[PDB]
Amino acid sequence: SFSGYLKLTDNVYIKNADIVEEAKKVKPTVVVNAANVYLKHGGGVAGALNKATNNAMQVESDDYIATNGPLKVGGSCVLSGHNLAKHCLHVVGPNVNKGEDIQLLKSAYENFNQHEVLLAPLLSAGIFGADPIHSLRVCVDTVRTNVYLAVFDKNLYDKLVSSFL
Ligand SMILES: COc1cccc([C@H]2CCOC[C@H]2C(=O)O)c1
């Protein structure tokens, strides 16, 4: 199972790790994708997870969108985890670079509560434009299930741990 994590709270754990490499190693029941409403996995975590599936995630996602239409900002859907996990929970955090309401970040993290344990990135961080320190705070104050956070950047990981209240 999960190794080398720092325990932040009763249920939140954090590690400086590449979430693709972490998913390939652990093969968790659920890996969270930092999705957009269209499930267009172009960059950031989504681009990396999709590339690790050899584009199978994007093909499955395009069929999901063709059937169901776009997700809501703050929403999610469960799709296959392909070669990375049993399932992928595609969660849409607000993209500050698109002018989306940061208050939807709590709604986005509430999707994690439907799964007992997840491997996840910080929602709305990175190319989504939000402050990762704030994202971690909302995560610990919203998620009650066991969440193993993978933070790609070592420098950001150190800043998140050193500033954690
Ligand atoms: C391959 O995934 C990456 C690659 C680069 C950056 C990120 C984001 C994900 C959101 O939190 C902040 C960043 C981080 O983890 O350091 C993810």
PDB file of all heavy atoms in Angstrom, residues 19 45 48 122 125-126 150-153 156, ligand 1:
ATOM      1  N   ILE A  19       2.435  11.765  -9.242  1.00  0.00           N
ATOM      2  CA  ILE A  19       1.221  10.971  -9.090  1.00  0.00           C
ATOM      3  C   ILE A  19       1.112   9.829 -10.101  1.00  0.00           C
ATOM      4  O   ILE A  19       0.567   8.796  -9.754  1.00  0.00           O
ATOM      5  CB  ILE A  19      -0.013  11.885  -9.100  1.00  0.00           C
ATOM      6  CG1 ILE A  19      -1.256  11.146  -8.602  1.00  0.00           C
ATOM      7  CG2 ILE A  19      -0.195  12.527 -10.466  1.00  0.00           C
ATOM      8  CD1 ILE A  19      -2.425  12.089  -8.378  1.00  0.00           C
ATOM      9  N   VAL A  45      -1.763  17.455 -14.226  1.00  0.00           N
ATOM     10  CA  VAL A  45      -2.002  16.082 -13.816  1.00  0.00           C
ATOM     11  C   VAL A  45      -2.780  15.314 -14.900  1.00  0.00           C
ATOM     12  O   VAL A  45      -2.482  14.150 -15.141  1.00  0.00           O
ATOM     13  CB  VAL A  45      -2.808  16.092 -12.488  1.00  0.00           C
ATOM     14  CG1 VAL A  45      -3.306  14.696 -12.142  1.00  0.00           C
ATOM     15  CG2 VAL A  45      -1.946  16.650 -11.360  1.00  0.00           C
ATOM     16  N   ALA A  48      -0.698  14.247 -17.834  1.00  0.00           N
ATOM     17  CA  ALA A  48       0.243  13.226 -17.443  1.00  0.00           C
ATOM     18  C   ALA A  48      -0.432  11.881 -17.217  1.00  0.00           C
ATOM     19  O   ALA A  48       0.061  10.846 -17.670  1.00  0.00           O
ATOM     20  CB  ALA A  48       1.015  13.679 -16.198  1.00  0.00           C
ATOM     21  N   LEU A 122      -3.510  18.034  -5.225  1.00  0.00           N
ATOM     22  CA  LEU A 122      -4.217  19.169  -4.666  1.00  0.00           C
ATOM     23  C   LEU A 122      -5.088  19.791  -5.754  1.00  0.00           C
ATOM     24  O   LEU A 122      -4.599  20.230  -6.797  1.00  0.00           O
ATOM     25  CB  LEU A 122      -3.266  20.214  -4.144  1.00  0.00           C
ATOM     26  CG  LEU A 122      -2.565  19.821  -2.864  1.00  0.00           C
ATOM     27  CD1 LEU A 122      -1.457  20.796  -2.572  1.00  0.00           C
ATOM     28  CD2 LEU A 122      -3.554  19.794  -1.707  1.00  0.00           C
ATOM     29  N   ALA A 125      -4.795  23.491  -7.810  1.00  0.00           N
ATOM     30  CA  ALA A 125      -3.413  23.954  -7.740  1.00  0.00           C
ATOM     31  C   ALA A 125      -2.773  23.833  -9.148  1.00  0.00           C
ATOM     32  O   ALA A 125      -3.465  23.519 -10.131  1.00  0.00           O
ATOM     33  CB  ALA A 125      -2.665  23.130  -6.656  1.00  0.00           C
ATOM     34  N   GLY A 126      -1.504  24.208  -9.272  1.00  0.00           N
ATOM     35  CA  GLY A 126      -0.816  24.107 -10.541  1.00  0.00           C
ATOM     36  C   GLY A 126      -1.453  24.995 -11.574  1.00  0.00           C
ATOM     37  O   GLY A 126      -1.781  26.148 -11.299  1.00  0.00           O
ATOM     38  N   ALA A 150      -0.306  13.560  -3.469  1.00  0.00           N
ATOM     39  CA  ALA A 150       0.975  13.527  -4.150  1.00  0.00           C
ATOM     40  C   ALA A 150       1.243  14.951  -4.655  1.00  0.00           C
ATOM     41  O   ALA A 150       0.435  15.535  -5.401  1.00  0.00           O
ATOM     42  CB  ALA A 150       0.936  12.533  -5.315  1.00  0.00           C
ATOM     43  N   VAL A 151       2.370  15.518  -4.225  1.00  0.00           N
ATOM     44  CA  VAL A 151       2.760  16.851  -4.639  1.00  0.00           C
ATOM     45  C   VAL A 151       4.019  16.680  -5.470  1.00  0.00           C
ATOM     46  O   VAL A 151       5.034  16.184  -4.990  1.00  0.00           O
ATOM     47  CB  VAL A 151       3.018  17.767  -3.425  1.00  0.00           C
ATOM     48  CG1 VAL A 151       3.497  19.126  -3.888  1.00  0.00           C
ATOM     49  CG2 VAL A 151       1.737  17.915  -2.608  1.00  0.00           C
ATOM     50  N   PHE A 152       3.927  17.018  -6.745  1.00  0.00           N
ATOM     51  CA  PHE A 152       5.009  16.823  -7.702  1.00  0.00           C
ATOM     52  C   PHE A 152       6.256  17.615  -7.386  1.00  0.00           C
ATOM     53  O   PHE A 152       7.363  17.066  -7.428  1.00  0.00           O
ATOM     54  CB  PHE A 152       4.449  17.202  -9.078  1.00  0.00           C
ATOM     55  CG  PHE A 152       5.395  16.973 -10.205  1.00  0.00           C
ATOM     56  CD1 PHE A 152       5.589  15.708 -10.706  1.00  0.00           C
ATOM     57  CD2 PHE A 152       6.019  18.043 -10.838  1.00  0.00           C
ATOM     58  CE1 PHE A 152       6.411  15.506 -11.813  1.00  0.00           C
ATOM     59  CE2 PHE A 152       6.854  17.840 -11.935  1.00  0.00           C
ATOM     60  CZ  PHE A 152       7.059  16.571 -12.405  1.00  0.00           C
ATOM     61  N   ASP A 153       6.075  18.913  -7.131  1.00  0.00           N
ATOM     62  CA  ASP A 153       7.197  19.820  -6.903  1.00  0.00           C
ATOM     63  C   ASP A 153       7.736  19.724  -5.476  1.00  0.00           C
ATOM     64  O   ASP A 153       7.003  20.026  -4.528  1.00  0.00           O
ATOM     65  CB  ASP A 153       6.757  21.246  -7.189  1.00  0.00           C
ATOM     66  CG  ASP A 153       7.919  22.216  -7.116  1.00  0.00           C
ATOM     67  OD1 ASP A 153       8.870  22.080  -7.943  1.00  0.00           O
ATOM     68  OD2 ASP A 153       7.884  23.109  -6.268  1.00  0.00           O
ATOM     69  N   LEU A 156       7.434  23.015  -3.459  1.00  0.00           N
ATOM     70  CA  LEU A 156       6.074  23.270  -2.996  1.00  0.00           C
ATOM     71  C   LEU A 156       5.738  22.310  -1.858  1.00  0.00           C
ATOM     72  O   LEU A 156       5.167  22.732  -0.860  1.00  0.00           O
ATOM     73  CB  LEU A 156       5.087  23.125  -4.149  1.00  0.00           C
ATOM     74  CG  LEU A 156       3.638  23.195  -3.742  1.00  0.00           C
ATOM     75  CD1 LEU A 156       3.302  24.518  -3.128  1.00  0.00           C
ATOM     76  CD2 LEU A 156       2.752  22.924  -4.924  1.00  0.00           C
TER      77      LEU A 156
HETATM   78  C1  LIG B   1       2.103  15.278 -12.883  1.00  0.00           C
HETATM   79  O1  LIG B   1       1.384  16.111 -11.974  1.00  0.00           O
HETATM   80  C2  LIG B   1       1.807  17.403 -11.777  1.00  0.00           C
HETATM   81  C3  LIG B   1       2.910  17.985 -12.382  1.00  0.00           C
HETATM   82  C4  LIG B   1       3.243  19.295 -12.062  1.00  0.00           C
HETATM   83  C5  LIG B   1       2.468  20.020 -11.170  1.00  0.00           C
HETATM   84  C6  LIG B   1       1.352  19.448 -10.577  1.00  0.00           C
HETATM   85  C7  LIG B   1       0.493  20.257  -9.621  1.00  0.00           C
HETATM   86  C8  LIG B   1      -0.745  19.482  -9.146  1.00  0.00           C
HETATM   87  C9  LIG B   1      -1.525  20.285  -8.138  1.00  0.00           C
HETATM   88  O2  LIG B   1      -0.714  20.622  -7.006  1.00  0.00           O
HETATM   89  C10 LIG B   1       0.390  21.465  -7.406  1.00  0.00           C
HETATM   90  C11 LIG B   1       1.314  20.828  -8.433  1.00  0.00           C
HETATM   91  C12 LIG B   1       2.160  19.783  -7.753  1.00  0.00           C
HETATM   92  O3  LIG B   1       1.747  18.700  -7.428  1.00  0.00           O
HETATM   93  O4  LIG B   1       3.373  20.171  -7.556  1.00  0.00           O
HETATM   94  C13 LIG B   1       1.031  18.126 -10.880  1.00  0.00           C
END
